[PDB]
Amino acid sequence: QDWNGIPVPANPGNGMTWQLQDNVSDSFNYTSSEGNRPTAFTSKWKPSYINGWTGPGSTIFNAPQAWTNGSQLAIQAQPAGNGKSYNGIITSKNKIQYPVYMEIKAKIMDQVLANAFWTLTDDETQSIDIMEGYGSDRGGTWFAQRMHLSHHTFIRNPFTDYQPMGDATWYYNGGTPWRSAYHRYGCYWKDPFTLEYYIDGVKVRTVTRAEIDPNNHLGGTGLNQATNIIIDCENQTDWRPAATQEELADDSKNIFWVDWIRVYKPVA
Ligand SMILES: OC[C@H]1O[C@H](O)[C@H](O)[C@@H](O[C@@H]2O[C@H]3CO[C@@H]([C@@H]2O)[C@@H]3O[C@@H]2O[C@H](CO)[C@H](O)[C@H](O[C@@H]3O[C@H]4CO[C@@H]([C@@H]3O)[C@@H]4O)[C@H]2O)[C@H]1O
Ligand SMILES: [Ca+2]
């Protein structure tokens, strides 16, 4: 695999080591697209959201915009007309649950669109955002230069959304924009109350119990459910400027590239 010899940066415990979870890991070293979906892909992933929802704001999730090129997954955006985009997404066919380390090597788009690697339960109440980036300087240099590290707890009806909002939820890298290179974005979901984030193999943030669910949307369980993996892009016009149609058409800038995803659990 692509990550051969790259250590897992999280601590598996004394007298423990890390073990790869095959069914949610992929080096994406195959070619695939709409009408050419091989087993290497369909055994693990589907190019759609976890249900029929087509995305927030000006997003239109669309299967053709997820594909692979022999070495990387492309999560692509396209013009949809009427101020909207078509947006790539994949989701896992298999669930994961703490304790679990999950990491991608990826390069976000030079777009105002969100690009994210995240989890979401079938009931849509629990989410971890391993990363959520906004690449273009047209969205503000402040955003282009920061990576969002967060999680959500929801009540579905009426819709109520909690995430931590402390300054440490947006991680700065000296002014280098995140669009400029591939980085490794990782998170150890250690238990329902403990999340650690890792960028380029370095621990950059720890979230503990008080920040997990202070409004009690989950009734005291914390982030405890088996959940789905998602990698997507979104046109989040409820709070972001809309992408222009020409930006969405520019294929030198409209692809969120993921070289690989790897997932491990701690073992003796
Ligand atoms: O950028 C990546 C993500 O980052 C953060 O994680 C965000 O929290 C996440 O947005 C969320 O994704 C899901 C979970 O909660 C919201 C949210 O936008 C989303 O789910 C939809 O929420 C809307 C309400 O705003 C609806 O409740 C919708 O329900 C659907 O209703 C019908 C159609 O399909 C089924 C769905 O449940 C139903 O039969 C939710 O899907 C990302 O931005
Ligand atoms: Ca690869």
Swiss-Prot record:
Detail which positions bind substrate. 53, 62-72, 76-78, 124, 156, 251
Q: Where is the active site?
A: S127, E132
Q: From which residue to which does any coiled coil extend?
A: none
Annotated ranges, domain GH16: 1-268
Q: What superkingdom heads the lineage?
A: Bacteria
This one is known as: Beta-agarase A catalytic chain
Name the species this protein comes from: Zobellia galactanivorans (strain DSM 12802 / CCUG 47099 / CIP 106680 / NCIMB 13871 / Dsij)
Q: Which gene encodes it?
A: agaA
